Short mmCIF file of N, CA and C in Angstrom, two decimals:
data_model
loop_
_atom_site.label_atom_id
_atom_site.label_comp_id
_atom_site.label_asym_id
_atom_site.label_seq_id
_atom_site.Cartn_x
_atom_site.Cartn_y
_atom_site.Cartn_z
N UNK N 1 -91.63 -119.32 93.60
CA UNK N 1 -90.38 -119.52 92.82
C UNK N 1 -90.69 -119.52 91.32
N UNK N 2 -89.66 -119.18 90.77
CA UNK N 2 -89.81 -119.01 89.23
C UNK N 2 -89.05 -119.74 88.69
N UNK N 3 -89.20 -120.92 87.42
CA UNK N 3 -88.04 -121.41 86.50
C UNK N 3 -88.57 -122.64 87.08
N UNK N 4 -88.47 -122.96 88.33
CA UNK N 4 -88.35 -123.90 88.94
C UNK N 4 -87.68 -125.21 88.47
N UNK N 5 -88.44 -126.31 87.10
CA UNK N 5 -87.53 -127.09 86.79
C UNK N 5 -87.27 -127.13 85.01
N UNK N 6 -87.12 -125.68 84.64
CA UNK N 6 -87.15 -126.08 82.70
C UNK N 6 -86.43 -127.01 82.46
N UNK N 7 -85.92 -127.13 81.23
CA UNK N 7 -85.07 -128.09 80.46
C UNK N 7 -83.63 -128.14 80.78
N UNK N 8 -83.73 -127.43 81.91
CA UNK N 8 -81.97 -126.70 82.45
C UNK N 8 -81.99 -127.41 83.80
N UNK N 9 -81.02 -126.86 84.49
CA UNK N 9 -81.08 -127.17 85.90
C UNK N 9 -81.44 -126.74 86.70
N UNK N 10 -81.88 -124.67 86.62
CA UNK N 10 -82.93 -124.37 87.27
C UNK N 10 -82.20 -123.81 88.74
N UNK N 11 -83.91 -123.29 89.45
CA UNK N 11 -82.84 -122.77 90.79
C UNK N 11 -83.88 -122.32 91.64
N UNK N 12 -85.26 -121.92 90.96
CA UNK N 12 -86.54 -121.42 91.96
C UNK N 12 -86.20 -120.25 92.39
N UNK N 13 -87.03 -119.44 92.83
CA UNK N 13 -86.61 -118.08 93.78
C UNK N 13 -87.93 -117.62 94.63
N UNK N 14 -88.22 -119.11 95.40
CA UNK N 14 -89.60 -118.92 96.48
C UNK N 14 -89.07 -118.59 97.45
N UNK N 15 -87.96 -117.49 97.62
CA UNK N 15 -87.90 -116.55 99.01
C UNK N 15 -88.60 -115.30 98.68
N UNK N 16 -87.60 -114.33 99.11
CA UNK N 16 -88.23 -112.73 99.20
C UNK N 16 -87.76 -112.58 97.87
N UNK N 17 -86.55 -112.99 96.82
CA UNK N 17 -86.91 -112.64 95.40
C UNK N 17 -88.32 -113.44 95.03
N UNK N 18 -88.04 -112.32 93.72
CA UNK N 18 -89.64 -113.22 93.07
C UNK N 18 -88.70 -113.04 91.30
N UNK N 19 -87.55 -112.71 91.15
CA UNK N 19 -87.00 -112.60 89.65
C UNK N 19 -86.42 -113.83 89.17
N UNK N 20 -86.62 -114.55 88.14
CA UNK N 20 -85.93 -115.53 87.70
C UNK N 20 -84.91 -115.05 86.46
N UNK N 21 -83.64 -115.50 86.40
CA UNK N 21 -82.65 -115.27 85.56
C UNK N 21 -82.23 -116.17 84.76
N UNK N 22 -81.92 -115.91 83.51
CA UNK N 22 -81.30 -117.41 82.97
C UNK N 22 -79.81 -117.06 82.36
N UNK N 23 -79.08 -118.34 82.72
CA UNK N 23 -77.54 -117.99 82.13
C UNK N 23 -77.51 -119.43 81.59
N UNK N 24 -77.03 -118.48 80.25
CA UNK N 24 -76.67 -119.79 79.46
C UNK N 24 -75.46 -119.40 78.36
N UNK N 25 -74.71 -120.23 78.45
CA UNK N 25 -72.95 -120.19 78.16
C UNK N 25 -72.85 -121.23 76.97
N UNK N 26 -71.60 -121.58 76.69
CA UNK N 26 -70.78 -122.60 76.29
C UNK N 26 -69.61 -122.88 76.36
N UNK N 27 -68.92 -123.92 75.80
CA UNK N 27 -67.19 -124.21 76.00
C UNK N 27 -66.66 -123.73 74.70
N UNK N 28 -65.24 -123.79 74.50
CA UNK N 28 -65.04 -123.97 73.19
C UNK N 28 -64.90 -125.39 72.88
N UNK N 29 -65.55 -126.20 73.06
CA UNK N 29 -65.68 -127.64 72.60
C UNK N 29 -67.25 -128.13 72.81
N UNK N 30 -67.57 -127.24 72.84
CA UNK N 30 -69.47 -127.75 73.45
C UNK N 30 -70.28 -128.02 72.30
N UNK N 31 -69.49 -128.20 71.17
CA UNK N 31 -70.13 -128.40 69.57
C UNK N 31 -71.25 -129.70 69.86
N UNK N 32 -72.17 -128.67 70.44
CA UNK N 32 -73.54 -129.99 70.78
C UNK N 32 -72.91 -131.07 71.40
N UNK N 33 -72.85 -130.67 73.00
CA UNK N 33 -71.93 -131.78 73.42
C UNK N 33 -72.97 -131.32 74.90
N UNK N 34 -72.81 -130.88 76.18
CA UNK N 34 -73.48 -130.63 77.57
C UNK N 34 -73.39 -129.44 77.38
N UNK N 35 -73.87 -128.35 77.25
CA UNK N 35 -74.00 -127.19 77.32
C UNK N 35 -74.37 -126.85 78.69
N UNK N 36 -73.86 -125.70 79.43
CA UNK N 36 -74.46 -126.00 80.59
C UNK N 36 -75.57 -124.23 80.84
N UNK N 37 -76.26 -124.65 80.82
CA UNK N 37 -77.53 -123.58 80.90
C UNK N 37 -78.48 -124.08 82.07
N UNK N 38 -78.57 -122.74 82.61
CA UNK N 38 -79.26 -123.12 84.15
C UNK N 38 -80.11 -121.57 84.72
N UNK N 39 -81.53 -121.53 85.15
CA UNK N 39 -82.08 -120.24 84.92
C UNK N 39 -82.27 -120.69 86.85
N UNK N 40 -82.47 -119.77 87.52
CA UNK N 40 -82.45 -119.61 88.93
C UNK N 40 -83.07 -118.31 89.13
N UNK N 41 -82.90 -117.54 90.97
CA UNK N 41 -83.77 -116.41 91.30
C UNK N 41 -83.20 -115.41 91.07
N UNK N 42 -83.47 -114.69 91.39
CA UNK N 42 -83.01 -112.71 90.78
C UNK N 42 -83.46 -111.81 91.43
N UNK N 43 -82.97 -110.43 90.87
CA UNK N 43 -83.86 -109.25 91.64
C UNK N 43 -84.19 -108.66 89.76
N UNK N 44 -83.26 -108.76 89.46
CA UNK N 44 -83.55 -107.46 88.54
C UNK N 44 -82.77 -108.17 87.36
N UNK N 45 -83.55 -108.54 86.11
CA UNK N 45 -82.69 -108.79 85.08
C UNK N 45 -81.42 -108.06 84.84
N UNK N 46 -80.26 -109.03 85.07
CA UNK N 46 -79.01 -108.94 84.55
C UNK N 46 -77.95 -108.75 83.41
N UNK N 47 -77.19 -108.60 83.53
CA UNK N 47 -76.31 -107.99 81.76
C UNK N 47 -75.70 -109.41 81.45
N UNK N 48 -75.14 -109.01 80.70
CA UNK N 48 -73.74 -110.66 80.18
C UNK N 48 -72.27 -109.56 80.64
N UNK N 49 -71.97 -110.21 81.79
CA UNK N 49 -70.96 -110.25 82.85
C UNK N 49 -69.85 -110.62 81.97
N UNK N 50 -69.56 -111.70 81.91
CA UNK N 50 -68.20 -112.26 81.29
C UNK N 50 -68.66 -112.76 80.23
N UNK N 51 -68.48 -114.06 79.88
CA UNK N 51 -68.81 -114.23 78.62
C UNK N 51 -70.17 -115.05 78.86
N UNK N 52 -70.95 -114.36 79.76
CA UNK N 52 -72.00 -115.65 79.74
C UNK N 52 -73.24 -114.52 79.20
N UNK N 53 -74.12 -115.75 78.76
CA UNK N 53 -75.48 -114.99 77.64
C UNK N 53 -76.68 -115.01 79.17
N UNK N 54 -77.34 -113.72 79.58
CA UNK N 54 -78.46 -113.95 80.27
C UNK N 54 -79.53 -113.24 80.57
N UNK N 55 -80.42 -113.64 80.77
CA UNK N 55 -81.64 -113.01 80.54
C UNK N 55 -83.00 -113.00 80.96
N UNK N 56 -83.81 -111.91 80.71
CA UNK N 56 -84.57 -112.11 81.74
C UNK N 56 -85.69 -112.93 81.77
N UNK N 57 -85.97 -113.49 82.71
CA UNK N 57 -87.52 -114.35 82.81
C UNK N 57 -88.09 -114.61 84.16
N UNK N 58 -88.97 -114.85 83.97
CA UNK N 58 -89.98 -115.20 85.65
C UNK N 58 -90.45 -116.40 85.07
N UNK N 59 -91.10 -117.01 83.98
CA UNK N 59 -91.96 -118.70 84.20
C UNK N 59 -91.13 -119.22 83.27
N UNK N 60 -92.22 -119.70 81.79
CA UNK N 60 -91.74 -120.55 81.12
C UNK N 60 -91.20 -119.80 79.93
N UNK N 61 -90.47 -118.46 80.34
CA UNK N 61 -90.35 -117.57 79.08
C UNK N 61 -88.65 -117.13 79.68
N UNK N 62 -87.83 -118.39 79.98
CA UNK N 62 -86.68 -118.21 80.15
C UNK N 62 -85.92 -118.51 78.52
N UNK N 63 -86.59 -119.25 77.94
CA UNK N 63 -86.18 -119.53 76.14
C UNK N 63 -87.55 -119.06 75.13
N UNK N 64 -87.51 -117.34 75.63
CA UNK N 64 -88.73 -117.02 75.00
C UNK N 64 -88.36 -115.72 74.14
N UNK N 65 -89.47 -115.36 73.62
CA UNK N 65 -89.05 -113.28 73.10
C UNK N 65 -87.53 -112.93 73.37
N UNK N 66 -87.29 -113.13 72.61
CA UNK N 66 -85.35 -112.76 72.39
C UNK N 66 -85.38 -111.71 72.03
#
């Protein structure tokens, strides 16, 4: 599993994925308030879907090389 427990809430992906993803959003009131950011398993780094920010990672490089 990858991500397993960063500073987020995380999600592992010790099945048959081996990709870790991270999505990380906000509210319009989240002015440094709970942000909710949470990186979990994958196949294949993902786009920004709706309005959420995400990106790719496998370890500790889910808040890394932007």
């Amino acid at each position: 599993r990858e991500c397993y427990l960063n500073p987020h809430d995380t999600q592992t992906c010790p099945s048959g994925q081996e990709i870790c993803y991270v999505k990380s959003w906000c509210n319009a009131w989240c002015s440094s308030r709970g942000k909710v950011l949470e990186f979990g398993c994958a196949a294949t780094c993902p786009s920004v879907n709706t309005g959420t920010e995400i990106k790719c990672c496998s370890a500790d490089k889910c808040n890394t090389y932007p």
